[PDB]
């Protein structure tokens, strides 16, 4: 009878009704990956009774073109081409209800230079799907071709060191404390003292923006005085991460422009600003000769648990793409969650020109960085100079070691605190380069106790804190040991 009825689609695939995502062409056991594909590795915990291939295909489809029922509108497009392929599923080591699922997405699916669009597809909906009890994005292969649309770090490790005139040892910093309550005046005091005592940097706390107790312009002006006073006293380029985090993008710029205008070398942003402001202020930082330090605030809400979320290693990739110059990536031995293996992989992702597969470090995909610049990892949170031998071994050369409490907590004052940390650092590096087995539980502590014999502030820091450790079990562990 009626025209709607005579022209119904009657094929197996585009007849109306629900068919499984695997039978919609989102699964292919022998897809061959192209060098232009976005690859994603997911850790999928299917619900009781849901097939492991089905859940992998479901994730492929709802992150590319599918929906829950069949649509004739597919056929207005080159739908073979746009469909993502779940193309491999292994079971997760030592578990028969959790799976590693590899999914490949066609290059053309993604807006050029838009982390917002990349994430809209890849994390948009699928983590809240009913058929899946848990889901974690473990890794991604960002293809060269997509990477070339992005800026990468504004300054990057190499140019940063050049603007600083500091090569050979890890760089040094401290978060100003207490976190909140200090007036701009006193902030400028802490910054002057710490920088004058040996620190390359200080920083605003992540949550120091502009508050009744201290409005932002006061902090910036008073810190600049402190910074330039420090550099006049030492003959070093100095700085402090002036926090430009704000409610609106107009305010963030206003703060960035103010930082620039008064001569600041560096500014910080919080991750809670979100990806679009981050990309904006990363382009801005390139164009205005500014270091951009990303504090990763909020990360561990999705990054902490192994069964579900986004692994921080993917956040590394996305943030290096967007173009931040620094990003916090963990300490191993401090107050914040850090397994040595996972931190090492984070550091490789941020620093290397390319990645080779290394499953113990959580590097699931091999990947070229497409001459995007290298992002400076930051090691921060409850660390002290008694741990310096551990810091050097675990974290390498290109890194900023931050000691907020480990500098300011020092009983002989802030300058004493800073000096203890830099002597610590320099002697440890000096020693490594000479061939000494610095990481040995005997030698390492001894190199510092020897350095302490000619540095008063160091003896004191060793005396005060050498018991201190944060010896707890990890949540984010590897599935392959070393």
């Amino acid at each position: 009878q009626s025209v709607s009825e005579r022209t119904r689609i009657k094929s197996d695939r585009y007849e109306s009704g629900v068919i499984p995502y695997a039978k919609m062409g989102y699964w292919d056991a022998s897809y061959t990956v192209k060098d232009t594909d976005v690859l994603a590795l997911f850790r999928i915990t299917p619900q009781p009774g849901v097939d492991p291939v089905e859940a992998a295909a479901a994730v492929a489809g709802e992150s590319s073109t599918a929906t829950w029922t069949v649509v004739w509108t597919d056929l207005l497009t080159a739908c073979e081409r746009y469909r993502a392929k779940a193309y491999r599923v292994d079971p997760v080591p030592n578990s028969a209800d959790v799976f590693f699922a590899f999914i490949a997405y066609e290059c053309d699916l993604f807006e050029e230079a838009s982390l917002a669009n990349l994430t809209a597809s890849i994390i948009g909906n699928v983590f809240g799907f009913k058929a899946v009890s848990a889901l974690r994005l473990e890794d991604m292969r960002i293809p060269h071709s997509y990477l070339x649309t992005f800026q990468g770090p504004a300054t990057g490790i190499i140019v940063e060191r050049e603007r600083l005139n500091k090569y050979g040892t890890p760089l040094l910093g401290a978060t100003v404390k207490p976190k909140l309550g200090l007036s701009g005046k006193n902030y400028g005091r802490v910054v002057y003292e710490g920088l004058k005592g040996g620190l390359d940097f200080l920083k605003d706390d992540e949550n120091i923006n502009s508050q009744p107790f201290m409005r932002w312009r006061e902090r910036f002006l008073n810190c600049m005085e402190g910074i330039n006073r420090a550099s006049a006293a030492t003959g070093e380029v100095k700085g402090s991460y002036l926090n430009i985090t704000a409610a609106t993008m107009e305010e963030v710029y206003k703060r960035a422009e103010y930082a620039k205008a008064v001569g600041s070398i560096v500014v910080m942003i919080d991750l809670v600003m979100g990806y679009t402001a981050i990309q904006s202020i990363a382009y801005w930082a390139r164009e205005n000769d500014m270091l951009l330090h990303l504090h990763r605030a909020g990360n561990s809400t999705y990054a902490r648990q192994k069964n579900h979320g986004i692994n921080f290693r993917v956040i590394c990739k996305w943030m290096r793409m967007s173009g931040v110059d620094h990003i916090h990536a963990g300490t191993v031995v401090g107050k914040l969650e850090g397994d040595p293996l996972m931190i090492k992989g984070f550091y490789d992702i941020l620093r290397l020109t390319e990645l080779e597969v290394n499953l113990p470090f959580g590097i699931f995909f091999e990947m070229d960085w497409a001459s995007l610049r290298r992002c400076m990892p930051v090691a921060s949170g409850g660390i002290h100079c008694g741990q310096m031998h551990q810091l050097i071994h675990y974290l390498g050369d290109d890194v900023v070691l931050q000691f907020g409490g480990g500098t300011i907590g020092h009983p002989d004052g802030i300058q004493a605190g800073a000096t203890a940390n830099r002597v610590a650092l320099e002697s440890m590096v000096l020693a490594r380069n000479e061939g000494v087995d610095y990481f040995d539980q005997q030698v390492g502590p001894q190199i510092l106790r020897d350095a302490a014999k000619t540095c008063g502030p160091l003896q004191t820091a060793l005396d005060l804190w050498k018991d201190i450790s944060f010896d707890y079990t990890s949540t984010d562990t590897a599935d392959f040991a070393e």
């Binding site: 190499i158 060191r161 050049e162 005139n165 500091k166 090569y167 050979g168 040892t169 040996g198 002006l221 600049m224 005085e225 330039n228 006073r229 550099s231 006049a232 006293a233 030492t234 003959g235 070093e236 380029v237 205008a261 008064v262 001569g263 290397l352 020109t353 001459s371 290298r374 050369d397 000096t419 830099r422 002597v423 320099e426 002697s427 590096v429 000096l430 380069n433 000479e434 061939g435 000619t454």
Partner: protein, 139 residues
């Protein structure tokens, strides 16, 4: 004051033998060494004076050390550093830089403040050595 540029400047002035070991490290890593001189200690003095060309071909620390001491004997009073340079892709930069020599009497700097708009200040870091005398007779 002690000029704390370079990466080992919160340690004591390095001996020839301690410098040879740092040179050894750098040569075993494939890096290129060079030696440079200045008597402008300003933090923004990017370009210190080259002492010859960088030593790319060299297979023996003693050569760097021999050049260091030739530079020591020819250059006026001031600062000498040795840099290590990594031509590798994704580095292409200095990876090590430390002071080998520093004059006995470094007065340092004063901070020079010019009034900008509102409360803003225009800072210039000024060196006593440089303002009093020309290059070659500052220390």
């Amino acid at each position: 004051m002690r000029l704390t540029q370079g990466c080992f400047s919160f340690l004591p002035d390095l001996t020839d033998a301690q410098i040879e070991k740092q040179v050894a490290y750098a040569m075993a890593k494939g890096w290129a060494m060079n030696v440079e001189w200045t008597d402008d200690p300003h933090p923004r003095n990017n370009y210190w004076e080259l002492w010859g060309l960088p030593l790319f071909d060299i297979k023996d620390p003693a050569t760097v050390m021999f050049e260091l001491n030739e530079a020591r004997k020819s250059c006026a009073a001031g600062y000498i550093r040795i840099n290590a340079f990594d031509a590798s892709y994704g580095v292409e930069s200095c990876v090590m830089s430390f002071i080998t020599n520093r004059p006995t009497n470094e007065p340092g700097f004063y901070l020079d403040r010019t009034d900008g708009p509102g409360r803003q200040i225009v800072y210039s870091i000024k060196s006593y050595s440089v303002q009093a005398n020309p290059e070659g007779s500052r220390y």
